[PDB]
Structure formats: C-alpha cells, structure tokens
Amino acid sequence: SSEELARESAEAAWRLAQASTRATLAMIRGDLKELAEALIELARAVQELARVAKEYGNDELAKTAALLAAHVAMLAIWVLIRAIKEGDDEVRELAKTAIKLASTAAKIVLDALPTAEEVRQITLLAKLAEEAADKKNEDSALAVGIAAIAVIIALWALEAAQKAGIEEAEKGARLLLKLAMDAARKKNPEEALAVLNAALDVSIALQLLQSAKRAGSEETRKLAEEMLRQALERARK
Amino acid sequence: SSEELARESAEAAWRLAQASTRATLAMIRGDLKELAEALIELARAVQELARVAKEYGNDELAKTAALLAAHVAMLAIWVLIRAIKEGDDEVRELAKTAIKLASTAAKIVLDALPTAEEVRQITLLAKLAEEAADKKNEDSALAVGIAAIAVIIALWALEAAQKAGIEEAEKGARLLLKLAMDAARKKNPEEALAVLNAALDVSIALQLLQSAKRAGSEETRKLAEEMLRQALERA
C-alpha cells in the first residue's frame, strides 16, 4: 500500500530528525554518554527506516537508510575511541551497541540491495567496527574511524556524482570506497588517512566541477577534472 | 581572463583541501590547539576562494565560497564552546581569529552577491558569532552554534530545492533560514534546535526526492509535503 509506505516512512523520518537533533546537541557539548545514548536512538530509527524500505521494496529509500547507517557507525567510532581513550566502559558499551544497531540496519539494506557494492562496503565497515569495539583496541578502532570518515566523504561524492552524471566522478568515488575499506581491513591509520585526503581532494574538485558546470566558466572544470585524476592517483599509489 | 580564473580557483581549492585534511586529522586526535589553528588556515583558504570569485564575477564560485565560510564559522563555534568550557584562553582566541577570517570571507561574497539573501544570512551569522566570541559566553555561543548548523541544513535544502524546482521547498528553506537567524539573534538554543529538527525533516524528504529520479517514488513527495507542514507549524 503506497499510503502505508508514505505513513511509515514519514513517521520514521521524523523520529530520524528527532534523534539527529539530540545527537547534534550532545556533539557540541562533548557529553559522550548523552551522545552515544543518542546514537543508539538514532541507530534504531535508521534500522526501522531500512526495515520499511525492505517491506515495500523502495530501493531509493533503502539507499538513504544505508547512507544514514554509515554516518551512525562513523560517529559511534569517534565516541568509541574517545571512550576507550578515557577508560569509560559505560560509554564504550553504549557506543558498541550503537555500532551493531547500525550494522544490522546496513544488513537490512544489504538484504534489499545485495547487488549495491557501496551497501556491502558500509556493511563491512560496520561489522569491522564491531570487531574494533569488542577488541578494546585504541589503535584498530582509530584506524577504522579514519577509514569511516573517508567512506562518508566518498559516499557524498558518489551521491553528488549521481547528479550531473559525471562518470569520472562516480568512478573516483568507487575507487576511494575500495581503498578506504582496504585500509580498514588492513587496520592501518596511515593508509586510511591517505584515502581521507584523496576523498577530500576529489570532493572539493566536485564542488568546483559543479560550480564550473553552472553558469559557464568551464575552464574551472578542466583543472578540477585534472585535480580529480591527480587525487585518484594519489590514492592508487 | 578565463585562464587565470581556472588558475587561481585551482590554487585556492588545493590549499582548501590541504587545510581540510589538516583540520580533520587534528579533529581526530582532539588537539583543539592544532584543530583551531587549522581552522584558521582553512578560513584563509575560504577567504581566498571568495576573493577569486569576486574579482572574476563567478557567482557560482562565490555561492560555494559563502557555503564554506559558514562551515568554518560553525566549526570554530564548536571549538570556542569546548574552549571557554575548558577555560582555554589560547584556544578561545585562536577560534576567535578563525571566526573573523570566515566573517571577512562572507563579507567578500556579499560584496560580489549582495542580492543573495542566503549570503546575507551567512554574513550576519558570522558577525553574530563574532560577538559571541568577544563576549566569551558559552550559552550565546551554543545557541549560535546550533543555529549555524540549522542554517547549513537549510542551505542544502535550498540548493536541492533549486534542482527539484519545488517552490514549496524553496519557500520552506527560506523561512527556516529566517527562523534560525532569529533564533540566533535571540540567542536561545531551544527554538534553534527546533528549527534544526524542522530543517532535517524537510531535507530528508528532499534527499529521498533527489534519489527518486529513477522510479516513481511519489511517496517521497508526500514526505516533503508533511515535513513542510510540520516546519510551517514550527514557525
């Protein structure tokens, strides 16, 4: 029922914003207990958004829920590393719960969109962050935390590459997602950080490409495509 | 000269990425000193990008530069909050200089795009955060920090509403910007968070509407209608 799809998705999208606002406020103040406990509430809302997208087969709604799961998993690692670095077992377990809640949400999207490689990479990153949480590791969780940020930036470069349809842009977003997940499985903070600056490099090129596509001045497009390829080679080698 | 426009735009975008990486790296380690002084170098990069768009009249490059200036000003409020909350005068002044550098960047975009309402809102937000800096008041700075990120969400909701061309989405992004800036001058974090939540409500339906290019996900249009109604009652 399309009426029921609009009902459940709208009410889950409202609970999504409610939890996002609660987490943003705690992100300012540094209240890690409230922030992690808010990422739990946020991970639930992403989970039921992935569940409604599976029930009604809305593939676009599943992709949105997968993107949100990646953001919750990434934030929960920054809370995880800052908790084990402060010896807070209560906040560490709160963050761990937020990780696995977002992991199950990604696995729900992976059940609806198994042939979506970016959803697989999101699911692998969350399950990889699960391991870093049960590990009580300040170094492995730090590495997957860097790689998580590189994935998030590459995911926005991908969705921005969907617009305008620049294939050199989405090809680059794919390369960064693979090299970030490769650096995450390697658990090397140096490699993941190298993928991070490359993801930033091409995403700024993208914004420069989109400001060069709009209202002419397409000379800013040439060197931003060249900047895109320079940065992709900065990640390859 | 279009050759020099591509030249200086690439040079400034390169130093923008180098400073963006330096800030992200310091944001991981929690080095608020290095993070603040990396937002300084990032604010100068946005200021050079705004200057370039001004001289060459690239309105699109000026709009993106204003967007960046708003981000740097918002990140510097984050740092200012955690600085005055920890009694760090060194980091508080480092954040203050980053706010003023981003404020100047917004002023330069305003010179090139004075008829852009969103550029005026950003310039007022940076000047208003500049006062919360000299005041070193953690409550006023927290309100303008929430209101800042509420402005950011309303700006992407604006940019997405231009693509979709939905006038109800454009009018909605405008009223959220006005209510956020009002909440920022009022310096009350409560209704500032409310405008933030409403901005998220509408923007979720816009991101799903922009991803709904492929199939008939017309239920997303019902997501936007009801989210825009919820945001109208938020006024």
Residue numbers in the entry:
A (entry chain C): 0 to 236
B (entry chain A): 0 to 234
Manuscript text:
To investigate the photophysics of special pairs independently of the complexities of native photosynthetic proteins, and as a first step toward creating synthetic photosystems for new energy conversion technologies, we designed C2-symmetric proteins that hold two chlorophyll molecules in closely juxtaposed arrangements. We describe de novo-designed proteins that hold Chl dimers in precisely defined, closely juxtaposed geometries.
The SP3x homodimeric design model agrees with the X-ray crystal structure to 1.61 Å Cα r.m.s.d.
